[PDB]
RNA sequence: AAGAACCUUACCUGGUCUUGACAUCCACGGAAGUUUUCAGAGAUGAGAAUGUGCCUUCGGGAACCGUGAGACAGGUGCUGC
RNA sequence: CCGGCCGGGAACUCAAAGGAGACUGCCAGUGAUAAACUGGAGGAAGGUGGGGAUGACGUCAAGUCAUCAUGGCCCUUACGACCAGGGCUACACACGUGCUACAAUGGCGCAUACAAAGAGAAGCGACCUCGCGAGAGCAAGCGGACCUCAUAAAGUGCGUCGUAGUCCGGAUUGGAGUCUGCAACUCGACUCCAUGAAGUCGGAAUCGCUAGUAAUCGUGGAUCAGAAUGCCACGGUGAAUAC
């Protein structure tokens, strides 16, 4: 898609991810960052991605390699 | 010998030279006709070689820069009428009646704050 | 205007063809500063007019214009009661202006091809005196004198 | 991209040219700043008309 | 050859420095070209007047940058130093390259 | 003829005929006709049948028509079922590409509603 | 407002501090500073390294940092009637 | 090497320093003879030459306590300060101010050609090579009448399209890419391929403009990491009508 030759991911979250990868899934992790672009290693693991007032529960699945954390999170309430 | 005439219009610098002879029209070392002189200032610059005499009595050498079509023409026009003086400038007195001894002074008016162009004013809600 | 006089410059005569009247016609016709596309249109229209009619060059558009020149125009005016339309006798200059003026709007309104052709066709049905320009001329004569003496 | 080197984003993000604003040097205003004096327009005018700024004058072109 | 390109707010001021380089040069040695004029740089600004709102009227400003160029084709090397240095160049900026 | 696509592009010049098929625009039309060796000016229907049969082979190479429609619809529906914002923006019927909605969503939102 | 992705940005939900982000002022200890780490979303707290310098009158002092004290600092807060 | 290129000429252009000229002055007529006016003369410029700068006494207890200063009032372990993410860009709507269209004086294709004003060192970045292009790698020259951005477009010459929601028009949306930055996720620009809504010229009503103007096509700057259809600046083409 876009953003040139390879995306960015968050360092502090990556060390928590290696616990989630090695030990397997446990619970939604409460993360302030939305910034990371998902790649295969985050798949099958419960995380939670901030919307500016709460971490939104994303369980990661197969095609999410195409996506960032942030995309599933709603920052503007509606009727 | 040579008869020189300068002139300007709209910041276009020209340099006209005249001597006797069955002249073709030479502009920047190419013909004006090979500069599309069917269209480019087509009879416009050959104004002193209209009213007071015919074309084929003077050889002519011209070098012009700046302007577009009408921009290029008037510097050469006012240089060529001034350069028309093989035996004196007596024909300027007849060209005075025609008005081609006086170049058109006019220039573009600047942009100023609060106008769309130069006199064009914006529209404004109610009154 | 109310006070100080206006009397503008008398424009360039058209190159070779020699009609300063047709030079003024292209200056009225001119779209958006394109004097170049205007001069491109006029000769193509003038050749197609003279080719169709079988006539000579200068008098072809001139005879077409001559029928469509009325001697009067009307003005909206009021002094007492609600608005009146008042006929007045045209200036001879403004006469030739008004004939040319209605032509360009008429040429836009035709069912025809591109502009050289459609303008020559408009001149054709003013030379034949049966089209839109004669219809626009043949109005004011009826309207006058129902309304004569107001200023 | 490459290895550990792209992961070196432990920087303060105060490094970036995306970060510093270029506020008005005298007043802190973050709007109306021309770089040439490095001030917002009003303190430029306040100085210029009071003749302090060298070689500066009105324009009438 | 050796040349001075000058820069100035005032045209009548850079004029005195390029007067002084001439009369210094033909005094101490010879061979100066005087002031080649060169086109003027004009820094034209426009800025908004009001503290708040009122976009409509603004004030225009200008800084005229007068340049001059002086060359010496002078080969008298041991009077070139006497031409050099000593001048204060009319209180406005000058640069002297070879 | 239908030229292996399902559209018939009758009585056009060949570049216009090739743009008329779904999934082929002016750029792809230029590449297909240059590949087949077929001049743009010629009327498409009029040309000899083996030169049509050449185009009938050539147009089939790129993915076109209802095949390209259903592929696009499947990626939209798939993303929409993910519950992504850009996905949900499909389901809600409002600007996906971040255009303003205070004014000017009038194409995608549609006719004015009471 | 001559430039809202963070910063900008003032506001919100969150995480924090309270002589503070910045002045003026004392004491006491420490060169300033250049390296690296764990825990944290970061601010940050909590580290190990190292360095330990121009004036000196041998109680120092200026550049400058950290801690603590009280006088205080601060406010795009309010009032353009 | 017949390219202003290289002697040279500095004539001449341009530039920028300094100056001249136009003052109702020259004449006639008209006008209370005066003031003034009309017309003509001569003259490159004639009746305030054109533009710009330049804004009377005073009006709206106008606007601005958020540029700043500041009387008074208030909070001062919170209305202060620091920091992360979010918001300021929402959307059944209404309006203002702009851009782009609805085309044939035009679209689309090839060839061909005159500018004017700028800006530039954590910059601008040729040239050269590489890439579908956006762009990428290597990299001179110049703090600028030199070098760079930078190859001005409308226009003009030929050819195609022919009245159609079109070889018009671009919305929307898909897929695949490039560029900046700690960061493109809410929330960037830009490229490529594909898709091809609305619109076939807009009600009542209303705005601007008297000459290099209106109109129309390009270029540039400030702002600036990246940010424009805005604003600010420049020129090209260039009118109509004013009883």
From TrEMBL, chain D:
One GO location term (cellular component): small ribosomal subunit
MF-aspect GO terms: rRNA binding; structural constituent of ribosome
Transmembrane segments: none
Domain of life: Bacteria
Keywords assigned by UniProt, alphabetized: Ribonucleoprotein, Ribosomal protein, RNA-binding, rRNA-binding
GO biological process: translation
SUBUNIT field: Part of the 30S ribosomal subunit. Contacts proteins S3 and S10.
Similarity section: Belongs to the universal ribosomal protein uS14 family.
Function, as annotated: Binds 16S rRNA, required for the assembly of 30S particles and may also be responsible for determining the conformation of the 16S rRNA at the A site.
Protein's name in the database: Small ribosomal subunit protein uS14
Phylogenetic lineage: Bacteria, Pseudomonadati, Pseudomonadota, Gammaproteobacteria, Enterobacterales
Residue span relative to the full protein: 41 to 101 of 101
